[PDB]
Amino acid sequence: KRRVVVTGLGMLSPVGNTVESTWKALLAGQSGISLIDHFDTSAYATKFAGLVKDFNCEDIISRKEQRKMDAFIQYGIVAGVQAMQDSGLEITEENATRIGAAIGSGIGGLGLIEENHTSLMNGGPRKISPFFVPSTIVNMVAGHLTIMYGLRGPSISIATAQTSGVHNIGHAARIIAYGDADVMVAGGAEKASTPLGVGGFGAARALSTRNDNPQAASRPWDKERDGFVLGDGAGMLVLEEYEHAKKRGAKIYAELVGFGMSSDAYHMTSPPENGAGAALAMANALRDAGIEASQIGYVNAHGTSTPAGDKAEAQAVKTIFGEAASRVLVSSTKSMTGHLLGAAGAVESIYSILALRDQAVPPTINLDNPDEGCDLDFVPHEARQVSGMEYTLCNSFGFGGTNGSLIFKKI
Amino acid sequence: KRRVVVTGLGMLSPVGNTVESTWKALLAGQSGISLIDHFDTSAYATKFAGLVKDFNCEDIISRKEQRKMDAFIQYGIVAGVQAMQDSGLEITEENATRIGAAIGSGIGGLGLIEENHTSLMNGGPRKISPFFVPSTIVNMVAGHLTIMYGLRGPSISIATAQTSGVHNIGHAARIIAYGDADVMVAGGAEKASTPLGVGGFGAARALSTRNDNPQAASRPWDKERDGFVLGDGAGMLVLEEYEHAKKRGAKIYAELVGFGMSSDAYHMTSPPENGAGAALAMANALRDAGIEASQIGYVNAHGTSTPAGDKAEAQAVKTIFGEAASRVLVSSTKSMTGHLLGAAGAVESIYSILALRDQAVPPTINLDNPDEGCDLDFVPHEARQVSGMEYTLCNSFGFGGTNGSLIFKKI
Numbered sequence: 127k128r129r130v131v132v133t134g135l136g137m138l139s140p141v142g143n144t145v146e147s148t149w150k151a152l153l154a155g156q157s158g159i160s161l162i163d164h165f166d167t168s169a170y171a172t173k174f175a176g177l178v179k180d181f182n183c184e185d186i187i188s189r190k191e192q193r194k195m196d197a198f199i200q201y202g203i204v205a206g207v208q209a210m211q212d213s214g215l216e217i218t219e220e221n222a223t224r225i226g227a228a229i230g231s232g233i234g235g236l237g238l239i240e241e242n243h244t245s246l247m248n249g250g251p252r253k254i255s256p257f258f259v260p261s262t263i264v265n266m267v268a269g270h271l272t273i274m275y276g277l278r279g280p281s282i283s284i285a286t287a288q289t290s291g292v293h294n295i296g297h298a299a300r301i302i303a304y305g306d307a308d309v310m311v312a313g314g315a316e317k318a319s320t321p322l323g324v325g326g327f328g329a330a331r332a333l334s335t336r337n338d339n340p341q342a343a344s345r346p347w348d349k350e351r352d353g354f355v356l357g358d359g360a361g362m363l364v365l366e367e368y369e370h371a372k373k374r375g376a377k378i379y380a381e382l383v384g385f386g387m388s389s390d391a392y393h394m395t396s397p398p399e400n401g402a403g404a405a406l407a408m409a410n411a412l413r414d415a416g417i418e419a420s421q422i423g424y425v426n427a428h429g430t431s432t433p434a435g436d437k438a439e440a441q442a443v444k445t446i447f448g449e450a451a452s453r454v455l456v457s458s459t460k461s462m463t464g465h466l467l468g469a470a471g472a473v474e475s476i477y478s479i480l481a482l483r484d485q486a487v488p489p490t491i492n493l494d495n496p497d498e499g500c501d502l503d504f505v506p507h508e509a510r511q512v513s514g515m516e517y518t519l520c521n522s523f524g525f526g527g528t529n530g531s532l533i534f535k536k537i
Numbered sequence: 538k539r540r541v542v543v544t545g546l547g548m549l550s551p552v553g554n555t556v557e558s559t560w561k562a563l564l565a566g567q568s569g570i571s572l573i574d575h576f577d578t579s580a581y582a583t584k585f586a587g588l589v590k591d592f593n594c595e596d597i598i599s600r601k602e603q604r605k606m607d608a609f610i611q612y613g614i615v616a617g618v619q620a621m622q623d624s625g626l627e628i629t630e631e632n633a634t635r636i637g638a639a640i641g642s643g644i645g646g647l648g649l650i651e652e653n654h655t656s657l658m659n660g661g662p663r664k665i666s667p668f669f670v671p672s673t674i675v676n677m678v679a680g681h682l683t684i685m686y687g688l689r690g691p692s693i694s695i696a697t698a699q700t701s702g703v704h705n706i707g708h709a710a711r712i713i714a715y716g717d718a719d720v721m722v723a724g725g726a727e728k729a730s731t732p733l734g735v736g737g738f739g740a741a742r743a744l745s746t747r748n749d750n751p752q753a754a755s756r757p758w759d760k761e762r763d764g765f766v767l768g769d770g771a772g773m774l775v776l777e778e779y780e781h782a783k784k785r786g787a788k789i790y791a792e793l794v795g796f797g798m799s800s801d802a803y804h805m806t807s808p809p810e811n812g813a814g815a816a817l818a819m820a821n822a823l824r825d826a827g828i829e830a831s832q833i834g835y836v837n838a839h840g841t842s843t844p845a846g847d848k849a850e851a852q853a854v855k856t857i858f859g860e861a862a863s864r865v866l867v868s869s870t871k872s873m874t875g876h877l878l879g880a881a882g883a884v885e886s887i888y889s890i891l892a893l894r895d896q897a898v899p900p901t902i903n904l905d906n907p908d909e910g911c912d913l914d915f916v917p918h919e920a921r922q923v924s925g926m927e928y929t930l931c932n933s934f935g936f937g938g939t940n941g942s943l944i945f946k947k948i
């Protein structure tokens with residue numbers, strides 16, 4: 127009966143270009159939200175986002191190859207390299223077959239979609255790049271990485287919008303636990319800070335508009351919430367079978383204990399007031415881990431800072447925790463990080479891991495005035511030390527009412 | 538130990554708007570390839586594709602809701618309804634939780650991407666539709682369908698480009714076999730016959746250019762091959778646990794016996810001459826099914842009619858079959874159907890099923906002059922009756938060297 131453990135991490139976030147730097151920033155309650163400058167935001171109702179600062183891949187990706195890939199792919203490859211390195215794993219002809227990847231994204235190569243389309247409109251199909259398809263499609267991070275590292279085991283790419291990160295990690299673990307693979311690099315990558323991404327979610331009325339204070343915009347559960355904030359980044363974890371990792375003396379961050387999925391069956395871009403769907407997703411992860419809601423010390427909420435969304439998740443926590451409801455710590459890193467969409471669940475799974483290694487829980491900043499009727503401990507303003515925390519749970523929910531929860535156990 | 542069976546089918550193809558009509562057409566060796574008329578193809582090097590003829594959803598989707606979804610979503614929903622109906626399954630409050638979906642697509646809502654982008658370029662972010670995101674993203678078919686049918690179990694969407702259909706079906710079966718679900722609607726949907734899809738794959742030099750004979754264009758293994766042909770469609774199958782299906786007296790088309798995945802780790806848009814990757818994918822499906830290459834009576838090849846691609850797959854068959862190499866029937870439905878990308882593996886999984894029900898195997902049309910050095914029986918020109926065939930295998934390969942194989946067993 128195969129157990130899965132995390133033996134490698136990598137990340138690119140609006141608050142740091144490494145795992146450690148990003149963790150540091152979050153515990154210090156820093157914000158990565160800034161004003162956009164790569165395109166004219168005049169007509170845009172939202173003019174800020176959590177961007178990746180001074181990105182550099184020169185040492186990892188030839189500017190020759192960079193031409194064949196959208197920022198989202200570029201990000202994910204870098205985070206994947208970080209993870210592969212940090213794992214210390216060495217690919218051998220024996221190995222190849224039993225190592226793979228499960229990496230996706232919510233929207234994929236918007237930027238190159240826009241470029242290629244603009245080109246076509248201005249000068250015809252003659253102007254489309256031969257790399258249009260391969261540079262924009264969601265599965266390309268798994269593509270480039272399996273090639274770069276000679277990985278030959280199972281490779282998949284789940285695109286469940288804002289739920290992607292959690293699904294890729296969850297299925298990567300299943301692939302391993304099932305016997306199909308021994309190691310899996312998994313997570314997600316996103317870079318939707320484009321005219322289309324901003325204008326698009328902007329058109330749905332899903333974005334915050336607090337342009338006077340981009341850092342105060344993302345405020346989960348606070349009463350002045352006005353919609354989620356966009357974030358770019360990538361998060362990746364090397365998942366590996368317990369005995370395979372030991373046999374190689376791998377540093378093991380944590381164990382992946384439970385994975386749960388659910389479907390809202392309600393509305394395409396909104397959850398029930400009731401949070402029924404998030405509840406089942408958490409409820410199935412517990413049952414998969416074989417433990418009780420009482421044992422969860424920390425929950426990394428999906429908490430996107432949308433009026434209807436944050437309320438639903440809260441509702442669902444009460445429902446699952448009941449008694450403990452107030453004794454469990456809950457927080458949204460999105461208060462500082464922004465919403466990474468297809469990468470949200472990857473980075474947050476990383477934070478849910480480090481919170482067990484460091485027995486510390488990052489805050490929900492901007493939580494000035496909670497929502498009324500809230501019994502929950504949303505860890506507002508300042509990180510919080512914890513005692514004997516053995517399990518953390520991570521939530522991701524997405525459009526189409528698709529939900530997922532991962533449960534991590536210490537050591 | 539949970540077995541998975543197919544208890545429902547649905548389809549939209551360039552040769553038929555139902556399962557039965559499409560099967561009929563294929564066995565008769567008909568072609569669905571035609572010249573494009575929905576956009577000006579003057580500047581286009583490829584001017585044809587396998588389109589879905591006289592699509593109608595009026596009875597299933599309100600023109601009110603149709604506004605919120607790309608053709609690709611519209612197609613997939615219809616095929617999903619067909620499948621749900623054909624399964625005879627009835628969703629009950631008990632049920633909901635244990636029924637879900639695993640549906641994806643290669644490229645998603647290109648058409649609405651183009652519309653929305655054009656709008657933005659012509660009149661600003663003000664012109665983007667509030668439905669931009671929800672109408673174009675890959676996971677929306679699973680979204681709309683879980684809602685329409687009150688499905689609350691696990692919902693996922695794998696986007697592994699041209700390998701998608703096989704992956705969604707394969708993982709849907711795993712979800713079931715693992716205990717996460719009892720029923721899963723699974724497959725894929727595509728509609729890339731757009732300026733971007735045509736110009737895009739056209740820019741990669743991956744499309745056939747035989748505009749003088751659109752019906753002769755798709756010719757897997759033939760010596761005058763000139764690249765794949767684009768096809769629109771959707772294919773869906775209801776997968777369900779054996780005892781759950783029996784307990785309800787479900788008509789059972791076949792059993793899903795093996796699922797295999799592999800990664801080429803070679804090139805982003807091309808397979809090794811050696812076909813090493815396809816071999817492992819087939820090789821793992823056999824091992825998963827617990828049977829031998831000898832027992833496979835029919836193989837539905839990925840056979841896309843690209844020079845480098847068809848050769849690689851052939852190579853891989855020899856490698857896996859060896860002795861039997863000539864005693865196993867191999868064929869490409871893409872000779873008539875075109876390439877459905879993210880939906881290819883769904884429809885072809887359907888054909889791999891019916892070939893067991895009807896003990897008949899559809900031909901590879903246009904196979905005038907094989908490639909030299911080929912020992913394989915590619916079932917050229919005319920469908921072929923078969924005797925005691927108990928297993929069929931279905932191949933899907935995609936960009937990023939991602940591969941997958943499904944193995945179906947009679948009854």
Ligand SMILES: C[C@]12C[C@@]34C=CC(=O)[C@@](C)(CCC(=O)Nc5c(O)ccc(C(=O)O)c5O)[C@@H]3[C@H](C[C@@H]1C4)O2
Nearest residue numbers: 288330331332395396397432433434435523524525
């Ligand atoms: C039609 C409306 C109704 C509206 C009303 C109140 C709201 O609060 C929002 C802004 C968002 C509802 C929501 O929270 N959706 C939601 C979700 O279901 C799953 C994931 C996420 C995520 O970001 O990962 C998410 O954002 C909705 C959205 C946009 C528009 C305005 O739908």
Ligand SMILES: C[C@]12C[C@@]34C=CC(=O)[C@@](C)(CCC(=O)Nc5c(O)ccc(C(=O)O)c5O)[C@@H]3[C@H](C[C@@H]1C4)O2
Nearest residue numbers: 699741742743806807808843844845846934935936
């Ligand atoms: C850079 C080049 C080299 C080139 C040369 C010879 C060829 O024959 C083609 C046209 C296609 C190779 C190929 O077969 N790729 C391939 C694949 O790996 C997996 C799936 C599929 C599918 O359609 O599901 C597929 O199409 C390639 C493509 C385009 C361009 C011309 O890469």
